[PDB]
A paper describes a structure:
Hydroxynitrile lyase from Linum usitatissimum (LuHNL) is an enzyme involved in the catabolism of cyanogenic glycosides to release hydrogen cyanide upon tissue damage. This enzyme strictly conserves the substrate- and NAD(H)-binding domains of Zn2+-containing alcohol dehydrogenase (ADH); however, there is no evidence suggesting that LuHNL possesses ADH activity. Herein, we determined the ligand-free 3D structure of LuHNL and its complex with acetone cyanohydrin and (R)-2-butanone cyanohydrin using X-ray crystallography. Moreover, the structures and mutagenesis analysis reveal a novel reaction mechanism for cyanohydrin decomposition involving the cyano-zinc complex and hydrogen-bonded interaction of the hydroxyl group of cyanohydrin with Glu323/Thr65 and H2O/Lys162 of LuHNL.
The structures for acetone cyanohydrin (CNH) complexed LuHNL (LuHNL_CNH) and (R)-2-butanone cyanohydrin (BCN) complexed LuHNL (LuHNL_BCN) were determined at a resolution of 1.58 and 1.72 Å, respectively. The RMSD between LuHNL_lig_free and LuHNL_CNH, LuHNL_lig_free and LuHNL_BCN was 0.524 and 0.309 Å, respectively, at Cα atoms of all four subunits. This indicates that the complex structures of LuHNL did not change significantly as compared with the ligand-free LuHNL structure. The electron density of all the structural features that was observed in the LuHNL_lig_free structure was also well defined in the complex structures, such as tightly bound NAD+ molecule, two tetra-coordinated Zn2+ ions, one hexa-coordinated Mg2+ ion, and S-nitrosylation of Cys265 in each subunit. In the LuHNL_CNH structure, the electron density of the acetone cyanohydrin (CNH) in the catalytic pocket was only observed in subunits of A, B, and C. However, the electron density of (R)-2-butanone cyanohydrin in the catalytic pocket of the LuHNL_BCN structure was well defined in all four subunits. These two complexes indicate the same substrate binding pattern in the catalytic site, which is different from the glycerol binding pattern in LuHNL_lig_free. In the substrate complexed structures, the nitrile group of the substrate replaced the water molecule observed in the LuHNL_lig_free structure to bond with the catalytic zinc ion coordinated with Cys63, His85, and Cys199 at a distance of 2.2 to 2.3 Å. The hydroxyl group of cyanohydrins oriented to form direct hydrogen bond interaction with Glu323 at a distance of 2.7 Å and indirect interaction with Lys162 via one molecule of water at a distance of 2.6 to 2.8 Å for each hydrogen bond. Furthermore, the hydrogen bond relay was extended to the O2D of NAD+ from Glu323 via Thr65 residue at 2.7 Å for each hydrogen bond. However, in LuHNL, it is the nitrogen atom of the substrate nitrile group that coordinates with catalytic Zn2+, rather than the oxygen atom of the substrate hydroxyl group.
Numbering used by the authors:
A (entry chain B): 9 to 422
B (entry chain A): 11 to 422
């Protein structure tokens, strides 16, 4: 879209009217509407989005996750686009750059950045207000009563829109290192792939000859399998109840699979994992990527006491917003870390991830996650924001299809 | 020892778990027991003193002992090798030893990692028995019948003589021959746990900020470590003002009485308010046993960068603890810790050298209320003075100013 004389763009975006509480439909809350996107201020990028792709956390967001008051909103944190314009103070970006902009920036000067061992930057942390720091939004719409109304972001931006505004301290560019990378690949690099790959590579720090357990092989868990295989793990144990995704995981380098719904009475997933290791010692690295609170506990219990790290990537709407651990196993060697975006720092680590993503085996793995067809640039599960709300609502139901690993939302021509 | 090498001595027997509504008198008694001679690589140890870890009181309440009663209590204590099994190496009769929960085989992938004491080969003896299902301890009951006593784990310390697998023992007498017994006793658990949690596990550096949740003997040992390592800020959280003041005397910079916070202010929010930009602490130590403080310690840590070290224990519903999910995902970093990650061969010799330094010794003396002239501690009971004196001492564990009760077992 071309801006009007005041620099405002009118474009399609996916609006969430309110939380979809249990028993409510997508139809109750989700609608494609025309929105107005204000021009970028200060160090902001306004970004022509190519595609978004559906993270389970996007579905949690529809259900009200981390948004007690921040409706109506434009959804989405997983996506890729092209810089269309920039605020006047912007440095180190140009119009035409291809960017992703995940939740955490990297100031490189706080004690967290300088530690070398985390991406939880003190200066560019999660924008939980879902607003600009002055309480405004670059997004608005004209409702049925003709009134101009504010739309919240997801966090520091929204990706389910033809045009997004994001603070450039959260952006990192793809076009210098990977000018030929297709859009849906760039989209999963913004969250799902970075998360599973980085949880294994950076956070669990998997070494050649390590044993790895992965609880949940959706897009995040399969990304973890691809990393564990690249890093020459001796053993890659995948746990899930979805036989399709367990089989995909086995095709991309998992060595052992466990269907948690088919375990003998009184055999826990952690016991099943331990049974596959020498003297039932457990795994060198335990990844949770399910959102199932039970699996966070089972992941902790699967890890070799003291030596191994359990990396929790999963998210969900839990009773009292709490998770639980078996205390005796926890005290006697538990080691559990929260992980966002795989610990992949947007300046220090993302460039090497992007170079890795171009290696043939890693690309084949991304193609499999996406069911990508390079001839048509279409993914197996794809919906286009220009095709209207009914198509989108059907696609959101089909996220639960057994063979839907990653739904893609096409936003603009490629 | 009799004709068969069996020692008859006093020990503190727990008959059954002390469940809520029961008294110490219901379950705790000083009795004469028989201690068999050591076999294989065992040490039989003349105990000098035990000292009361909060986990000793949890044991009385049934902690980790669903079936392992009756037992001799105790895992914190120090003694002198009286005899050894025929296969023992690297120990002599007369050596002063402690024998904590975890050994250090030095060859398993956990030992070889260099970053944990959770040895795969010498782990916790949860059976509370010898590997053949027998015990070195027994007693003659009122029926005149000979009956087995369980250990605590690999041994019991609340006895004049104990037997332990020498793969769990480490000697005090070469590095610290003049160390008083109660100091050796707290080195075996409380002081190693608090000091190690800060020094080894949280790896506190000069200029770091530290929060310690619970300033009993473990948390005060953590204060001593944080001071020794030149932490910029040492924040202590407790309900007990006497122990908070003691922590401040031994190096703490800021104290918070959790029971005097406004209802809407959490312990983690109070700790973060003491830190620049409410960023929280570089190292967060839980040493309370209060499940709430395990969650608050996790939340007080700088997101991602900092480590929360959980040392606390308790009897929790369904044996489960909980964490606030959003704060956990966005940077939580929590580890279970046993004995301060202090490995009995690689780390304990260094800890023991540290204990001999005047400031650290002064801190151990303050924990103990130790009088060097009388070798008496502020709170001390002798096993030879009878069950009623012990039952009153066990009640006095809860006294405001009781940091560490010592159970004297033999002349020093
Ligand atoms: N931490 C982060 O930065 C980050 C990034 C991506 C996603 N997430 C979260 O991580 C998780 C994985 O993301 P995703 O998009 O791959 O999710 P997904 O829903 O596509 O995949 C999760 C997988 O876990 C399995 N699983 C869920 N509940 C299960 C149960 N009860 N029994 C057995 N298997 C079960 C599912 O069958 C599925 O294969 C989600 O919880 C998501 O919200 C977080
Ligand atoms: N992990 C290990 O190897 C190891 C070693 C020693 C002790 N422990 C455990 O660590 C903890 C500390 O041991 P200790 O012997 O110093 O215990 P302690 O009982 O002497 O001291 C605990 C301190 O925490 C405070 N605390 C407890 N509940 C509180 C609450 N509700 N509000 C505020 N403050 C509270 C108490 O007032 C006290 O000062 C205990 O849970 C003990 O079982 C474990
Ligand atoms: Mg802005
Ligand atoms: Mg033995
Ligand atoms: Zn995501
Ligand atoms: Zn930073
Ligand atoms: Zn103890
Ligand atoms: Zn070992």
């Amino acid at each position: 879209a071309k801006p009007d004389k005041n620099g405002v763009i009118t474009c399609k975006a996916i609006m969430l009217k309110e939380a979809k509480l249990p028993g409510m439909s997508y139809a109750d809350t989700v609608q494609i509407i025309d929105i107005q996107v204000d021009p970028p201020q200060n160090v902001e990028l306004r970004v022509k989005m190519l595609c978004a792709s559906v993270c389970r956390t996007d579905i949690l967001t529809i259900e009200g996750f981390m948004a007690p008051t921040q409706f109506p909103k434009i959804n989405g944190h997983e996506g890729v686009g092209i810089i269309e314009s920039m605020g006047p103070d912007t440095k180190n970006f140009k119009v035409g750059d291809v960017i992703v902009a995940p939740t955490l920036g990297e100031c490189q000067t706080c004690s967290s950045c300088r530690s070398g061992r985390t991406n939880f930057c003190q200066n560019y942390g999660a924008n939980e207000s879902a607003l600009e720091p002055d309480g405004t939004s670059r997004f608005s719409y004209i409702d049925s009563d003709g009134k101009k109304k504010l739309l919240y972001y997801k966090l520091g931006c929204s990706t389910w829109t033809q045009y997004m505004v994001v603070d450039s301290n959260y952006a990192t560019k793809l076009n210098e290192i990977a000018p030929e990378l297709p859009p849906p690949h760039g989209s999963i690099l913004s969250c799902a792939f970075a998360t599973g790959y980085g949880a294994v590579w950076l956070d669990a720090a998997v070494q050649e000859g390590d044993s790895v357990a992965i609880f949940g092989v959706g897009s995040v868990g399969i990304s973890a399998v691809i990393a564990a295989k690249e890093l020459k793990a001796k053993q890659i144990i995948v746990v899930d109840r979805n036989e399709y995704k367990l089989k995909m995981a086995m095709e991309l380098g998992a060595t052992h699979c466990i269907n948690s719904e088919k375990l003998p009475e009184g055999v826990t997933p952690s016991q099943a994992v331990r049974k596959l290791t020498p003297k039932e010692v457990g795994v060198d690295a335990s990844i949770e990527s399910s959102g199932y609170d039970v699996f966070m506990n089972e992941a902790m219990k699967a890890a070799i006491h003291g030596k191994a790290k359990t990396v929790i990537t999963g998210e969900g709407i839990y009773e009292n917003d709490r998770i639980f651990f078996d205390f005796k196993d926890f005290l006697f060697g538990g080691n559990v870390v929260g992980n966002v975006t795989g610990r992949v720092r947007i300046h220090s680590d993302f460039p090497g991830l992007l170079r890795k993503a171009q290696e043939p085996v890693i690309r084949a793995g991304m193609d499999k996650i996406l069911g990508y067809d390079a001839a048509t640039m279409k993914c197996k599960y794809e919906v286009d924001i220009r095709e209207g709300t009914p198509a989108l609502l059907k696609a959101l139901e089909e996220v639960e299809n057994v063979d839907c690993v990653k739904l893609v939302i096409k936003l603009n021509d490629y």
